């Protein structure tokens, strides 16, 4: 039998069996409630749609996302998730099948103790194991060093690996991601007259975000062109018409990744947090991460960040060393690959969490040798 | 269209890795001539000194018939 | 104590060819080909069933104006 | 179209400048390496020669030492 | 290394502010253990170590074994990644680089001083090392001042009010002559 990589992240689950390409499924993870009550009756109405179906009847729904930033919050929603994941979405039963989860770094531990008790008791699958999101999209690129920015949808954690050799004082983990981004451009938005505040409307507003924002090679010089001539206002249209535009705040939104004093974040941007990460590293192998810079998640997609993280890092950086920035087309999905790669490996399968130690040992089993 | 999108990347792909080796046959090449020269100069100064030598043996053979009539 | 993990044999950065190479061949094809397909079968038929349902339009309007005419000279009292 | 042909023909230019760049460098890089080795040979030879030449000086010194304090 | 451990059990520090929160929590809970495998077997199993704090705006936290194991870095520097040993073997090397007539003295005499040593139980692990180190026989004595925040600063002042101190100093003129590379001379 094969082995199930889910990877449930935060803002998109994905899920698919091991040894494939792309995941089988991808789908938001939000559990929407009614809240008006409903007057016909015999319409088979449901308590709660999740999955994507709440995305397209969220008219009537209450979306409530049941991760805030890597952590879970909301028990009963991830746990309904992981329902549908399982026997809706795939329709294989997890009894037979092990599972590979996925965590952030730096999390704190009841996450992944009820992570695995919730695995063991509910779902009874046969072995569960825990990998963190940055190991496994470096597996993913087939490069064996380097400096991976995993800036998924609720945290954005940088981890630096030397062949293959992992380094736990160097890792930089910021609060700052997708969803922020999002509530900023949410913001902005309303500068011109569009009043954005229902949680149904952030998913347009996330859409908008995602088909029009870009990051600026140069801040201040776009700004300073745009705010004088028309040539970046962009239009798009709503789900009922009312045709907006958009001017300067196309590049204002993803900005905030590189200078998060705009939503009164205190850290620094993302181009000198990596860097600066560099520069805890020891100093023989700073070459080596400086070559082989990686991008991954779904955050870092923005069309034009390759550039832009590429000049400030090289601004940054001693003027000898050759920065590089490699950043495949396929980033969204790389933390799966990675999984679906490391599930198939005949090295990995002695590495899984038995029943039989999770009976013997507790929940704890995962904070010791067994990772 | 689409295979237009799949085209033009995989286009950009090869751009990137010919660029790569370009830069590092350079790289390669400056430093392969800067050890050249330094093995030149080292020859240079190794026959000055080997002409220095011969000169004080020829300055000794001539003190050398001084030594014997003496 | 942190986990330790068994050493193995082999291998990475040496599936990237054969999960990549693949599709980059392969897909711009196959995509190619469902284009080409696509197109034939969309473009021309509609234009032409197109040009089909308006000739039978322009003999529904003739149809109507006759009868409309003879109506119109039968009842006009 | 006209932008996207002229683009993708731009991108095989750039492409192939820079394999040509790599060819050049390349060889420049393999006629340095054996010009070094050509030097290395000639260096060694020359010290062997400067060894032998430093030790009939010093044989020389002896014997003028030896016939000036006779 | 204690913001950074903080958010294994789920209270996140980052902005500059609240590290000095994090440095009051440090300066009011943490301590250092005498043995520190059965001490961290001891927390994971019992409950006697928990102890409660009170942040600036309420919503207290509860720090289990992150109160000896933030000290602990003191003795082994291998936790924030470090070449380097620990305190306790530090010590012990620079005793054993000076010559072979005054180490007795040196070990009946150590003195410790700074604010990071007022933890209270490192008077005692200090003295545990250095006996597992130091040869057997000779004894270990480690001089804790209640003072020692303030020891250097006594120390100060005390030379200052010296007699024969009074011609040690840079005059002014001195500088003027010859720059401020005169620190660097017999007048240090
Ligand atoms: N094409 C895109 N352009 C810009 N932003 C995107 C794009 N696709 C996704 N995003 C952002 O990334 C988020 C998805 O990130 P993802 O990698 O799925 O997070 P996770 O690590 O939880 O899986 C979305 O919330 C969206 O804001
Ligand atoms: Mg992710």
Known sequence: ?371 | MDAIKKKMQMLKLDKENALDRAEQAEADKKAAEDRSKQLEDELVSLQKKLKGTEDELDKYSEALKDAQEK | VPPKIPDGERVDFDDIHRKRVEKDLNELQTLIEAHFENRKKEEEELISLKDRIEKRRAERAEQQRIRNEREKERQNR
């Not at chain 1, 960040?305 to 003027?319: F, G, V």
């Open chain 1, 1 to 371: 039998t094969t082995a199930l990589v889910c990877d449930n992240g935060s803002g998109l689950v994905k899920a698919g069996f091991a040894g494939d390409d792309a995941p089988r499924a991808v789908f938001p993870s939000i559990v929407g409630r009614p809240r008006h009550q409903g007057v016909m009756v015999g319409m088979g109405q449901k308590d709660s749609y999740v999955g994507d179906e709440a995305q397209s009847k969220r008219g009537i729904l209450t979306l409530k996302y049941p991760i805030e930033h890597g952590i879970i919050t909301n028990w009963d929603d991830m746990e309904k998730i992981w329902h549908h994941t399982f026997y809706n979405e795939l329709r294989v039963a997890p009894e037979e099948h092990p599972t590979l989860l996925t965590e952030a770094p730096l999390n704190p531990k009841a996450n992944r103790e009820k992570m695995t008790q919730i695995m063991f008791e509910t779902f009874n699958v046969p072995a569960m194991y825990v990998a963190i999101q940055a190991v496994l999209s470096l597996y993913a690129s087939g490069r064996t060093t380097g400096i991976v920015l995993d800036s998924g949808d609720g945290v954005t954690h940088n981890v630096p690996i030397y062949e293959g050799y992992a380094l736990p004082h160097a890792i930089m983990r910021l609060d700052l991601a997708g969803r922020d981004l999002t509530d900023y451009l949410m913001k902005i938005l309303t500068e011109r007259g569009y009043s954005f505040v229902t949680t149904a409307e952030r998913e347009i507003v996330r859409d908008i975000k995602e088909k029009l924002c870009y990051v600026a090679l140069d801040f201040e010089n776009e700004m300073a062109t745009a705010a004088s001539s028309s040539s970046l206002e962009k239009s798009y249209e709503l789900p009922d018409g009312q045709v907006i535009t958009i001017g300067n705040e196309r590049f204002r939104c993803p900005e905030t990744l590189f200078q998060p004093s705009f939503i009164g974040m205190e850290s620094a941007g993302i181009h000198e947090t990596t860097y600066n990460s560099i520069m805890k590293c020891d100093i023989d192998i700073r070459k080596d991460l400086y070559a082989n810079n990686v991008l991954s998640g779904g955050t870092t997609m923005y069309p034009g960040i390759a550039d832009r993280m590429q000049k400030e890092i090289t601004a940054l950086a001693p003027s000898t060393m050759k920065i590089k920035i490699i950043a495949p087309p396929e980033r969204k999905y790389s933390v799966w690959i990675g999984g679906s790669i490391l599930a198939s490996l005949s090295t990995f399968q002695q590495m899984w969490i038995s029943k039989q130690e999770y009976d013997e040992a507790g929940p704890s089993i995962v904070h010791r040798k067994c990772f």
